[PDB]
Amino acid sequence: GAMNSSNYAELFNNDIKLFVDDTNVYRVTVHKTFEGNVATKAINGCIFTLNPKTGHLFLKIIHTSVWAGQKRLSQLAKWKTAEEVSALVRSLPKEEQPKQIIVTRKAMLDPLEVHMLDFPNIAIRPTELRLPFSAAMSIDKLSDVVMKATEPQMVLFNIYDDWLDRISSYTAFSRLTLLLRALKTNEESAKMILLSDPTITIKSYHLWPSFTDEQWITIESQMRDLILTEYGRKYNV
Amino acid sequence: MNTVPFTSAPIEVTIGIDQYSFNVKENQPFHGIKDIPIGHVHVIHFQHADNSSMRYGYWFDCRMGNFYIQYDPKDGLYKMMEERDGAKFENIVHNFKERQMMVSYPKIDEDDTWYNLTEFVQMDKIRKIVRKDENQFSYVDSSMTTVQENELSDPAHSLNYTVINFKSREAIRPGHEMEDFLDKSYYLNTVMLQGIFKNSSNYFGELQFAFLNAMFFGNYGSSLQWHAMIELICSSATVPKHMLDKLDEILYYQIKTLPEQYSDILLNERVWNICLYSSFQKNSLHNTEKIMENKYPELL
Ligand SMILES: CCOC(=O)Nc1cccnc1
Ligand SMILES: CCOC(=O)Nc1cccnc1
């Protein structure tokens, strides 16, 4: 069934699984028309599919041309999401296909269930967690490859950089979620935190800075502070 | 006019004949039902006084043979049987009629209810949904499950209704996943109506045959089948105009006849609110919507 705090460690066992998040597939700017009406201009977006055990991120990029001449785009976007995940699995060798796909929004379950009728042995599951994956477009290198795309394509990343060399996937996932929660709650402060010290750089083949173990502890604590803070500023506590 | 004689009534029982029913007391001198209108299929059903568990009953067509009821004290129920000796049957019926030991099928002359509930129900198809080929009549009870329920356990005693599943390869064409899931016209018109049923009358017959088993026996899998077949039509953007007109008429009479106190377990809130208020055919069931809103506004 659904995934929550009580079965949180299933994510790190040895059954292949993927999270799918569709919060950034259909993105628009809203603006005024010369006639004083309102209209949307779509911008590029992406389907965020992540293996939580390995860190592998299949960033399957949505160029704006896919919306051309289409109606009911919010609904189409959940089906577009479902269609591009299903062809990814189809392409993938059988021993690499996921045994479970966990959607971050319940509206994806039916679109994905229908697109995967051919895979009756892949479990499609919801989750009770409030995962911060929408903040993935606050990672500069991901935002950049999405906005530069001139056609629909898929770029592959490891969202954990090299972290699994030193920490377990449970700990890697917790860092990632704390980073993303921070970026989601206050992007500026979150980003100011990450890049204040110009001696710590982001390798060309990485998304995040090259922190030592001790520097990550400082960083992680600062990100908690921020999340505590913004929570007070938001509720006056 | 035809007759279903009873050998006797050894146990107290509520007897149903179509939409009518009457109480018979233990060993009351009851010898059956007369004046049954030829031309329609009928159902004669039973609820024992001592154990309301298990409503059961028999679907039959008097044109297909001479049928009687005889209590069987081993198996403990009223069983339908066929008398093949026709002279023996007429003689038996005539005696019971002369001694006036039969209740009269009580049809009001203004009343087309039964015809409107069975218009497309066909007895020959009933034998195939309820497989028991040595008998011309078909037994059904509360507890019988459907073929599809047995997929999610005795297959000889099941209801082989038409399998409808909206999230199935049969229902969804490769490459039209979203189109076919949001607008079921392909599944209704090509897969079901053109491929399985052959025509809308065969389709209306199962919907009517689903509903009657739900209403008369509280058969859950039959209720599920009625609602599925309604939903497949309401959720199709393209339905022949005559099917929508007839559907409205079919449902109107089914809702009219439902016992007022049974709406809470026989009617699915999600299917009805979807069909009447959200679906492609929301503006196409005027009669059915007017009666639902005046009689079960709570469900909606
Ligand atoms: C929105 C972009 O979609 C993809 O790039 N999809 C895809 C399809 C098949 C295999 N791998 C990826
Ligand atoms: C499935 C093909 O259609 C039917 O068999 N209809 C039906 C079933 C039972 C009673 N009357 C009609």
Coordinates of C-alpha atoms and ligand atoms in Angstrom, one line a residue:
Chain A
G1 CA 0.0 0.0 0.0
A2 CA 1.2 3.4 1.0
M3 CA 4.7 4.4 2.3
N4 CA 5.2 6.3 5.6
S5 CA 7.3 6.7 8.7
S6 CA 6.8 3.2 9.9
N7 CA 8.2 1.5 6.7
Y8 CA 10.8 4.2 6.0
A9 CA 13.7 1.8 5.8
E10 CA 12.2 -0.2 2.9
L11 CA 13.7 2.5 0.6
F12 CA 17.2 1.2 1.3
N13 CA 16.8 -2.5 1.0
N14 CA 17.9 -4.4 -2.2
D15 CA 14.6 -4.4 -4.1
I16 CA 15.0 -1.9 -7.0
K17 CA 12.6 1.0 -6.5
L18 CA 12.1 4.5 -7.9
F19 CA 10.4 7.7 -6.6
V20 CA 8.6 9.7 -9.3
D21 CA 7.8 13.3 -8.7
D22 CA 5.8 15.2 -11.2
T23 CA 5.7 18.7 -9.5
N24 CA 8.0 20.3 -12.0
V25 CA 6.6 18.7 -15.2
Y26 CA 4.2 21.5 -16.2
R27 CA 5.6 24.9 -15.2
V28 CA 4.1 28.3 -16.2
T29 CA 4.7 32.0 -15.7
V30 CA 1.4 33.9 -15.3
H31 CA 1.4 37.4 -16.9
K32 CA -0.9 40.1 -18.1
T33 CA -2.1 40.4 -21.7
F34 CA -2.2 43.7 -23.6
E35 CA -5.9 43.6 -23.1
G36 CA -5.4 43.4 -19.4
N37 CA -6.4 39.7 -19.4
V38 CA -4.2 37.0 -17.8
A39 CA -2.4 34.2 -19.8
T40 CA 0.2 31.6 -19.0
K41 CA 3.5 31.1 -20.8
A42 CA 4.9 27.6 -20.2
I43 CA 8.5 27.0 -19.5
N44 CA 10.5 23.8 -19.7
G45 CA 10.2 21.4 -16.8
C46 CA 11.2 17.8 -15.9
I47 CA 10.0 14.5 -14.5
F48 CA 12.1 13.8 -11.4
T49 CA 12.7 10.0 -11.0
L50 CA 15.1 8.9 -8.3
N51 CA 16.6 5.6 -7.1
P52 CA 16.9 6.3 -3.3
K53 CA 19.4 3.5 -2.8
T54 CA 21.9 4.4 -5.5
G55 CA 21.2 8.1 -6.0
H56 CA 20.7 7.6 -9.7
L57 CA 18.4 10.5 -11.0
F58 CA 16.8 9.9 -14.4
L59 CA 16.0 13.6 -15.2
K60 CA 13.7 13.1 -18.2
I61 CA 13.4 16.8 -19.5
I62 CA 10.0 18.3 -20.7
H63 CA 10.5 20.9 -23.4
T64 CA 7.5 23.3 -23.9
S65 CA 6.8 22.0 -27.4
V66 CA 5.1 19.0 -25.8
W67 CA 2.2 21.3 -24.7
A68 CA 1.6 22.8 -28.1
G69 CA -2.0 22.7 -29.1
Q70 CA -3.0 20.6 -26.1
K71 CA -5.9 21.3 -23.7
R72 CA -6.2 20.5 -20.0
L73 CA -2.5 20.7 -19.5
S74 CA -2.4 20.0 -15.8
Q75 CA -4.1 16.7 -16.5
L76 CA -2.1 15.9 -19.5
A77 CA 1.1 16.4 -17.5
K78 CA 0.3 13.5 -15.2
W79 CA -0.2 11.3 -18.2
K80 CA 3.0 12.7 -19.9
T81 CA 4.8 11.8 -16.6
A82 CA 3.3 8.3 -16.6
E83 CA 4.2 7.8 -20.4
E84 CA 7.9 8.7 -20.1
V85 CA 8.4 6.6 -16.9
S86 CA 6.8 3.6 -18.6
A87 CA 9.0 3.9 -21.7
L88 CA 12.1 4.3 -19.4
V89 CA 11.3 1.0 -17.7
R90 CA 10.6 -0.7 -21.1
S91 CA 14.1 0.4 -22.4
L92 CA 15.9 -0.6 -19.1
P93 CA 17.2 -4.5 -19.0
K94 CA 14.7 -6.6 -17.0
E95 CA 17.1 -7.1 -14.2
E96 CA 17.3 -3.3 -13.8
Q97 CA 13.6 -2.6 -13.9
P98 CA 12.1 -1.4 -10.6
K99 CA 10.1 -3.7 -8.4
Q100 CA 8.2 -0.7 -7.0
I101 CA 7.5 2.8 -8.2
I102 CA 6.5 5.3 -5.4
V103 CA 4.7 8.4 -6.6
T104 CA 4.9 11.5 -4.6
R105 CA 1.3 12.6 -5.5
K106 CA -1.8 10.4 -5.4
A107 CA -3.0 11.9 -8.7
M108 CA -0.2 10.0 -10.4
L109 CA -1.3 6.6 -9.3
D110 CA -4.0 6.0 -12.0
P111 CA -2.0 7.5 -14.9
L112 CA 1.0 5.3 -14.0
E113 CA -1.1 2.2 -13.2
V114 CA -2.7 2.4 -16.7
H115 CA 0.6 3.1 -18.5
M116 CA 2.2 0.1 -16.7
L117 CA -0.6 -2.6 -17.2
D118 CA 2.1 -4.5 -19.1
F119 CA 4.2 -4.7 -15.9
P120 CA 1.6 -6.3 -13.5
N121 CA 4.5 -7.3 -11.2
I122 CA 5.7 -3.7 -10.6
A123 CA 3.9 -2.2 -7.6
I124 CA 2.7 1.4 -7.9
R125 CA 2.5 2.9 -4.5
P126 CA 1.6 6.2 -2.9
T127 CA 3.3 7.8 0.1
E128 CA 2.3 9.8 3.2
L129 CA 5.7 11.5 3.4
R130 CA 5.9 15.1 2.4
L131 CA 9.0 14.8 0.4
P132 CA 10.7 18.1 -0.8
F133 CA 11.4 16.9 -4.3
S134 CA 9.8 20.0 -5.9
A135 CA 12.8 21.9 -4.7
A136 CA 14.9 20.1 -7.3
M137 CA 14.9 23.1 -9.6
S138 CA 16.7 25.0 -6.8
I139 CA 19.8 22.8 -7.6
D140 CA 21.5 25.1 -10.1
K141 CA 23.0 22.5 -12.3
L142 CA 19.6 20.7 -12.7
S143 CA 17.8 24.0 -13.3
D144 CA 20.4 24.9 -16.0
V145 CA 20.1 21.8 -18.1
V146 CA 16.3 22.1 -18.0
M147 CA 16.2 25.7 -19.1
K148 CA 18.8 25.3 -21.9
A149 CA 17.0 22.3 -23.5
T150 CA 15.8 22.9 -27.0
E151 CA 14.1 19.4 -27.5
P152 CA 12.8 16.7 -25.1
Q153 CA 15.7 14.5 -23.7
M154 CA 16.9 12.6 -20.5
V155 CA 20.1 13.6 -18.5
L156 CA 21.4 11.2 -15.9
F157 CA 22.8 12.4 -12.5
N158 CA 23.8 11.0 -9.2
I159 CA 22.1 13.3 -6.7
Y160 CA 24.3 12.0 -3.9
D161 CA 27.6 13.0 -5.7
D162 CA 30.2 10.6 -4.2
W163 CA 28.6 10.5 -0.7
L164 CA 27.9 6.7 -0.7
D165 CA 31.7 6.3 -0.5
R166 CA 31.5 7.5 3.1
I167 CA 27.9 7.2 4.3
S168 CA 25.0 4.8 3.9
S169 CA 22.0 5.4 1.6
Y170 CA 19.8 6.0 4.6
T171 CA 22.1 8.8 5.7
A172 CA 22.6 10.1 2.1
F173 CA 18.8 10.3 1.6
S174 CA 18.4 12.1 4.9
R175 CA 21.0 14.7 3.9
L176 CA 19.4 15.2 0.5
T177 CA 15.9 15.6 2.0
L178 CA 17.3 18.1 4.6
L179 CA 19.0 20.1 1.8
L180 CA 15.9 20.1 -0.3
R181 CA 13.5 21.0 2.5
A182 CA 15.8 23.9 3.2
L183 CA 15.9 25.0 -0.4
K184 CA 12.1 24.8 -0.4
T185 CA 11.5 26.8 2.8
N186 CA 14.0 29.6 2.1
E187 CA 16.0 29.3 -1.2
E188 CA 18.2 32.3 -0.6
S189 CA 19.3 31.4 2.9
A190 CA 19.6 27.8 2.0
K191 CA 21.8 28.8 -0.9
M192 CA 23.8 31.4 1.0
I193 CA 24.5 28.6 3.5
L194 CA 25.8 26.2 0.9
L195 CA 28.2 28.6 -0.9
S196 CA 29.4 31.1 1.7
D197 CA 32.9 29.7 1.9
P198 CA 34.4 30.1 -1.6
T199 CA 37.2 27.6 -0.9
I200 CA 34.7 24.7 -0.9
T201 CA 33.9 24.1 -4.6
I202 CA 31.4 22.0 -6.6
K203 CA 33.3 19.6 -8.8
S204 CA 32.3 19.8 -12.4
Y205 CA 30.8 16.3 -12.2
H206 CA 28.8 17.1 -9.0
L207 CA 25.7 18.9 -7.9
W208 CA 26.8 19.9 -4.3
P209 CA 30.0 21.2 -2.8
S210 CA 32.9 19.1 -1.7
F211 CA 32.4 19.1 2.1
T212 CA 34.5 17.1 4.5
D213 CA 32.6 14.9 7.0
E214 CA 33.1 17.6 9.6
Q215 CA 31.9 20.4 7.3
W216 CA 28.8 18.4 6.4
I217 CA 27.9 18.3 10.1
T218 CA 28.1 22.1 10.3
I219 CA 26.1 22.5 7.1
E220 CA 23.4 20.0 8.1
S221 CA 23.0 21.8 11.5
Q222 CA 22.8 25.2 9.8
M223 CA 20.1 23.8 7.5
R224 CA 18.1 22.5 10.5
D225 CA 18.4 25.9 12.1
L226 CA 17.1 27.5 8.9
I227 CA 14.1 25.1 8.8
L228 CA 13.4 25.7 12.5
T229 CA 13.7 29.5 11.9
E230 CA 11.5 29.9 8.8
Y231 CA 9.0 27.8 10.8
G232 CA 9.0 30.4 13.5
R233 CA 8.9 33.4 11.1
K234 CA 6.0 31.6 9.5
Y235 CA 4.1 30.9 12.7
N236 CA 5.5 33.5 15.1
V237 CA 7.1 31.2 17.7
Chain B
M1 CA -51.6 -17.6 -18.3
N2 CA -49.3 -20.2 -16.6
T3 CA -49.0 -21.8 -13.2
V4 CA -46.3 -22.9 -10.9
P5 CA -47.9 -25.4 -8.5
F6 CA -46.3 -26.3 -5.2
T7 CA -46.4 -29.8 -3.8
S8 CA -46.8 -28.4 -0.3
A9 CA -45.3 -25.7 2.0
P10 CA -43.8 -27.5 5.0
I11 CA -41.9 -24.6 6.4
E12 CA -42.9 -21.0 7.1
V13 CA -41.5 -18.9 4.3
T14 CA -41.9 -15.5 2.6
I15 CA -42.4 -16.3 -1.2
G16 CA -41.6 -13.7 -3.8
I17 CA -42.9 -13.8 -7.4
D18 CA -41.2 -11.0 -9.4
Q19 CA -41.8 -7.8 -7.5
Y20 CA -44.6 -9.4 -5.3
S21 CA -44.4 -11.4 -2.1
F22 CA -46.6 -13.1 0.4
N23 CA -46.2 -15.0 3.7
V24 CA -47.0 -18.7 4.0
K25 CA -47.2 -20.2 7.4
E26 CA -45.7 -23.6 8.4
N27 CA -47.9 -26.3 6.8
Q28 CA -50.4 -23.8 5.5
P29 CA -52.4 -25.3 2.6
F30 CA -50.5 -23.5 -0.1
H31 CA -50.3 -25.0 -3.6
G32 CA -48.7 -22.4 -5.7
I33 CA -49.1 -19.4 -8.0
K34 CA -51.5 -19.1 -10.9
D35 CA -52.1 -16.5 -13.7
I36 CA -48.4 -15.8 -14.3
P37 CA -48.2 -13.6 -17.5
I38 CA -46.7 -15.5 -20.4
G39 CA -44.1 -13.7 -22.4
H40 CA -41.7 -12.5 -19.7
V41 CA -39.0 -14.2 -17.7
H42 CA -39.9 -14.6 -14.0
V43 CA -38.2 -15.2 -10.7
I44 CA -39.8 -17.1 -7.8
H45 CA -37.8 -16.6 -4.6
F46 CA -37.7 -17.5 -0.9
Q47 CA -36.8 -16.3 2.5
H48 CA -37.3 -18.8 5.3
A49 CA -39.0 -17.5 8.4
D50 CA -36.4 -19.2 10.7
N51 CA -33.2 -18.2 8.8
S52 CA -33.4 -14.9 6.8
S53 CA -29.8 -15.9 5.8
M54 CA -29.9 -17.0 2.2
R55 CA -32.5 -15.4 0.1
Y56 CA -32.6 -17.8 -2.9
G57 CA -34.7 -18.3 -6.0
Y58 CA -35.3 -19.5 -9.5
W59 CA -35.3 -17.7 -12.9
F60 CA -37.7 -19.3 -15.3
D61 CA -39.8 -18.9 -18.5
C62 CA -43.1 -20.8 -18.5
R63 CA -42.8 -21.2 -22.3
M64 CA -39.8 -23.5 -21.7
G65 CA -41.7 -26.2 -19.7
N66 CA -44.0 -27.1 -16.9
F67 CA -42.3 -26.2 -13.6
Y68 CA -43.3 -26.9 -10.0
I69 CA -41.9 -26.3 -6.5
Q70 CA -41.4 -29.1 -4.0
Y71 CA -39.7 -28.7 -0.6
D72 CA -36.7 -31.0 -0.1
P73 CA -36.2 -31.8 3.7
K74 CA -32.7 -33.1 3.2
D75 CA -31.3 -30.1 1.4
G76 CA -33.7 -27.8 3.2
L77 CA -35.0 -25.6 0.6
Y78 CA -37.9 -25.2 -1.9
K79 CA -36.6 -26.7 -5.1
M80 CA -37.8 -25.9 -8.7
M81 CA -38.5 -29.0 -10.7
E82 CA -39.7 -29.8 -14.2
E83 CA -42.6 -32.1 -14.8
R84 CA -42.1 -33.9 -18.1
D85 CA -45.5 -35.7 -18.0
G86 CA -47.7 -32.9 -19.3
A87 CA -51.0 -34.7 -18.7
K88 CA -49.9 -35.4 -15.1
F89 CA -49.1 -31.7 -14.8
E90 CA -52.4 -30.3 -16.2
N91 CA -54.4 -32.7 -14.0
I92 CA -52.4 -31.7 -10.9
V93 CA -52.9 -28.0 -11.6
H94 CA -56.6 -28.3 -12.4
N95 CA -57.3 -30.0 -9.0
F96 CA -55.4 -27.3 -7.1
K97 CA -57.3 -24.5 -9.0
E98 CA -60.7 -26.1 -8.4
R99 CA -59.9 -26.3 -4.7
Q100 CA -58.7 -22.7 -4.9
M101 CA -55.4 -23.3 -3.1
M102 CA -53.3 -21.0 -5.4
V103 CA -52.5 -17.4 -5.1
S104 CA -53.0 -15.3 -8.2
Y105 CA -50.1 -13.4 -9.8
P106 CA -51.5 -10.0 -8.9
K107 CA -50.9 -7.9 -12.0
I108 CA -52.6 -4.5 -12.2
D109 CA -53.6 -3.8 -15.7
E110 CA -52.1 -0.3 -15.8
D111 CA -48.8 -1.7 -14.6
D112 CA -45.9 -2.2 -17.0
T113 CA -43.3 -2.4 -14.1
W114 CA -42.2 -6.1 -14.7
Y115 CA -42.0 -5.7 -18.5
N116 CA -40.0 -2.5 -18.0
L117 CA -37.5 -4.3 -15.6
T118 CA -37.0 -7.4 -17.8
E119 CA -37.5 -6.0 -21.4
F120 CA -34.0 -7.2 -22.5
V121 CA -33.5 -9.9 -19.9
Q122 CA -33.3 -13.2 -22.0
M123 CA -33.8 -16.6 -20.3
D124 CA -31.4 -18.5 -22.7
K125 CA -28.5 -16.1 -21.7
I126 CA -29.3 -16.6 -17.9
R127 CA -28.5 -20.4 -18.3
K128 CA -25.0 -19.3 -19.5
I129 CA -24.4 -16.7 -16.8
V130 CA -25.6 -19.3 -14.2
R131 CA -24.3 -22.6 -15.7
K132 CA -26.5 -25.6 -14.9
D133 CA -27.4 -27.0 -18.3
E134 CA -29.6 -29.9 -17.3
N135 CA -32.3 -27.5 -16.0
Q136 CA -34.2 -25.0 -18.0
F137 CA -34.6 -22.7 -14.9
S138 CA -31.7 -21.1 -13.1
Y139 CA -31.0 -21.0 -9.3
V140 CA -29.4 -17.8 -7.7
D141 CA -28.8 -16.9 -4.0
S142 CA -27.4 -14.1 -1.9
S143 CA -24.0 -15.8 -1.5
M144 CA -23.1 -16.8 -5.0
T145 CA -20.0 -14.9 -6.2
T146 CA -19.1 -13.8 -9.7
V147 CA -16.4 -15.0 -12.0
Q148 CA -14.6 -11.8 -11.5
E149 CA -14.9 -12.0 -7.7
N150 CA -13.3 -15.5 -7.9
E151 CA -10.3 -13.8 -9.7
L152 CA -9.6 -11.4 -6.8
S153 CA -14.3 -20.2 -5.1
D154 CA -16.5 -23.1 -6.5
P155 CA -16.8 -22.3 -10.2
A156 CA -19.9 -24.5 -10.8
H157 CA -22.0 -22.3 -8.5
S158 CA -20.8 -18.8 -9.7
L159 CA -22.4 -15.9 -11.6
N160 CA -20.5 -15.8 -15.0
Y161 CA -21.2 -12.1 -15.6
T162 CA -19.4 -10.2 -18.4
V163 CA -15.9 -9.2 -17.1
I164 CA -15.5 -5.4 -17.1
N165 CA -12.3 -3.8 -15.6
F166 CA -11.4 -0.2 -16.5
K167 CA -7.7 -0.7 -15.7
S168 CA -7.1 -3.7 -18.0
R169 CA -5.4 -4.3 -21.3
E170 CA -8.8 -5.1 -22.8
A171 CA -10.0 -1.7 -21.8
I172 CA -6.9 0.3 -22.8
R173 CA -5.3 0.4 -26.2
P174 CA -1.5 0.7 -26.3
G175 CA -0.8 4.3 -27.2
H176 CA -4.2 5.7 -26.1
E177 CA -3.8 5.1 -22.4
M178 CA -5.0 8.5 -21.4
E179 CA -7.6 8.8 -24.2
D180 CA -9.1 5.4 -23.5
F181 CA -9.1 5.8 -19.7
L182 CA -10.9 9.2 -19.7
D183 CA -13.3 8.4 -22.5
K184 CA -14.3 4.7 -22.5
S185 CA -16.1 4.8 -25.9
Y186 CA -13.6 2.3 -27.4
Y187 CA -14.2 -0.3 -24.7
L188 CA -18.0 0.2 -24.7
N189 CA -18.5 0.3 -28.5
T190 CA -15.8 -1.8 -30.0
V191 CA -14.7 -4.2 -27.3
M192 CA -17.9 -4.8 -25.5
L193 CA -20.9 -4.0 -27.8
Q194 CA -19.4 -5.0 -31.1
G195 CA -17.1 -7.8 -29.8
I196 CA -18.8 -9.6 -26.8
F197 CA -22.6 -8.7 -26.5
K198 CA -23.2 -8.2 -30.3
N199 CA -25.9 -5.5 -29.7
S200 CA -27.2 -3.2 -27.1
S201 CA -30.2 -5.4 -26.2
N202 CA -27.8 -8.2 -25.0
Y203 CA -26.0 -5.4 -23.0
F204 CA -29.3 -4.1 -21.5
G205 CA -30.3 -7.6 -20.6
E206 CA -27.2 -8.2 -18.3
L207 CA -27.6 -4.7 -16.7
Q208 CA -31.3 -5.6 -15.9
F209 CA -30.2 -9.2 -15.0
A210 CA -27.5 -7.7 -12.7
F211 CA -29.8 -5.3 -11.0
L212 CA -32.6 -7.9 -10.3
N213 CA -30.2 -10.3 -8.6
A214 CA -28.9 -7.5 -6.4
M215 CA -32.4 -6.3 -5.5
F216 CA -34.0 -9.7 -5.0
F217 CA -31.1 -11.6 -3.4
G218 CA -28.8 -8.9 -2.0
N219 CA -26.1 -10.4 -4.2
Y220 CA -23.2 -8.1 -3.9
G221 CA -21.3 -9.2 -7.0
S222 CA -24.4 -8.5 -9.0
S223 CA -24.7 -5.0 -7.6
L224 CA -21.0 -4.4 -8.6
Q225 CA -21.9 -5.7 -12.1
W226 CA -25.0 -3.4 -12.5
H227 CA -22.9 -0.3 -11.4
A228 CA -19.9 -1.3 -13.7
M229 CA -22.2 -1.5 -16.8
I230 CA -23.8 1.8 -15.9
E231 CA -20.5 3.5 -15.4
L232 CA -19.0 2.2 -18.7
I233 CA -21.9 3.9 -20.6
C234 CA -21.8 7.1 -18.6
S235 CA -18.1 7.4 -19.0
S236 CA -18.2 7.0 -22.8
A237 CA -18.3 10.3 -24.8
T238 CA -19.8 8.5 -27.8
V239 CA -22.9 6.4 -27.2
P240 CA -25.6 5.7 -29.8
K241 CA -28.5 8.1 -29.1
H242 CA -31.0 5.3 -28.7
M243 CA -29.0 3.5 -26.1
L244 CA -28.9 6.6 -23.9
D245 CA -32.7 7.1 -24.3
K246 CA -33.3 3.5 -23.3
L247 CA -30.7 3.5 -20.5
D248 CA -32.5 6.5 -18.9
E249 CA -35.8 4.5 -19.1
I250 CA -34.2 1.3 -17.7
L251 CA -32.6 3.0 -14.7
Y252 CA -35.7 5.1 -14.0
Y253 CA -37.8 1.9 -13.4
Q254 CA -35.0 0.2 -11.5
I255 CA -34.8 3.2 -9.1
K256 CA -38.5 3.5 -8.9
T257 CA -38.8 -0.2 -7.8
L258 CA -36.0 -0.3 -5.3
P259 CA -37.2 -0.7 -1.7
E260 CA -36.9 2.7 0.0
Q261 CA -35.0 1.3 2.9
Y262 CA -32.4 -0.6 0.9
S263 CA -30.8 2.4 -1.0
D264 CA -27.9 2.6 1.4
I265 CA -26.4 -0.8 0.4
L266 CA -27.6 -1.3 -3.2
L267 CA -26.6 2.1 -4.5
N268 CA -23.0 3.3 -5.0
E269 CA -22.6 7.0 -4.1
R270 CA -19.5 7.4 -6.3
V271 CA -20.9 5.8 -9.4
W272 CA -24.2 7.7 -9.2
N273 CA -22.8 11.1 -8.4
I274 CA -20.2 10.6 -11.2
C275 CA -22.8 9.4 -13.7
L276 CA -25.4 12.1 -13.1
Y277 CA -23.2 15.1 -12.3
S278 CA -19.7 14.6 -13.8
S279 CA -19.7 12.2 -16.7
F280 CA -20.1 12.7 -20.4
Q281 CA -23.8 11.6 -20.1
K282 CA -24.6 13.8 -17.1
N283 CA -27.2 15.7 -19.2
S284 CA -28.5 12.6 -20.9
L285 CA -30.4 10.8 -18.1
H286 CA -33.2 13.3 -17.4
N287 CA -35.8 10.8 -16.1
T288 CA -33.2 8.9 -14.0
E289 CA -31.8 12.1 -12.5
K290 CA -35.2 13.5 -11.6
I291 CA -36.3 10.4 -9.8
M292 CA -33.0 10.0 -8.0
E293 CA -33.0 13.6 -6.8
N294 CA -36.6 13.4 -5.5
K295 CA -36.2 10.0 -3.8
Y296 CA -32.5 9.7 -2.7
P297 CA -31.2 13.2 -2.5
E298 CA -29.2 12.1 0.5
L299 CA -26.9 9.8 -1.6
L300 CA -26.1 12.9 -3.7
Ligands
LIG1 C1 10.4 14.0 -21.1 C2 11.6 13.3 -21.7 O1 11.3 11.9 -21.7 C3 12.3 11.1 -21.9 O2 13.4 11.4 -22.0 N1 11.7 9.8 -21.8 C4 12.4 8.6 -22.0 C5 11.7 7.7 -22.9 C6 12.3 6.5 -23.1 C7 13.5 6.2 -22.5 N2 14.1 7.1 -21.7 C8 13.6 8.3 -21.5
LIG2 C1 -23.3 -11.2 -22.2 C2 -24.1 -11.3 -23.5 O1 -25.2 -10.6 -23.0 C3 -26.0 -11.4 -22.2 O2 -25.7 -12.5 -21.9 N1 -27.0 -10.7 -21.7 C4 -27.9 -11.2 -20.8 C5 -27.5 -11.9 -19.8 C6 -28.5 -12.4 -18.9 C7 -29.8 -12.2 -19.2 N2 -30.2 -11.5 -20.2 C8 -29.3 -11.1 -21.0

